[PDB]
Write a protein that binds this DNA or RNA. Structure first.
Ligand SMILES: [Zn+2]
Ligand SMILES: [Zn+2]
Ligand SMILES: [Zn+2]
Ligand SMILES: [Zn+2]
Lengths: 70, 72
DNA sequence: CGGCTGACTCATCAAG
DNA sequence: CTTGATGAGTCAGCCG
């Protein structure tokens, strides 16, 4: 019952994937607007409830890898 | 906290107006369905929790007079 | 209906 | 102060 992107409690199947609400609207914002997020680490940041704001780049990558799409 | 159309307990701002769930669904089917509504009295019916089922014409008219709009 | 999911809005924070 | 990112809340269509 866990968000496949950040492991928060999932609220439902959004854009094809079991995710929480915050990840649902994160993906929609990221897929429409500008694209160029930059990772400050090595593109494998830990994305969980407490750290998901740190790296949009890695959070967006995980959304794609889990299969989110419009 | 009461539906502006039938005075039943309101549920939220629906189609631009504070209304109940039943009136919300009624209004959308009225706007979009093929509907020959005719009042059996004087186009001035009492519309409440029970009587709203009797006169869809007056119920509709009240929906529109209250401001409901599917675009709102 | 009411469950499901998407669109939209707004308060709160971080940054500058 | 302003700007931008975040996430919670409300209400929309659709479906059964
Ligand atoms: Zn998540
Ligand atoms: Zn990263
Ligand atoms: Zn009502
Ligand atoms: Zn009537």
């Amino acid at each position: 019952k866990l968000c496949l992107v950040c492991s928060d409690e999932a609220s439902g199947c959004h854009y094809g994937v079991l995710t929480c609400g915050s990840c649902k609207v994160f993906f929609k914002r990221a897929v429409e607007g500008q694209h160029n997020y930059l990772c400050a680490g090595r593109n494998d940041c830990i994305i969980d409830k407490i750290r998901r704001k740190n790296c949009p780049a890695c959070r967006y990558r995980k959304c794609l890898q889990a299969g989110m799409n419009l």
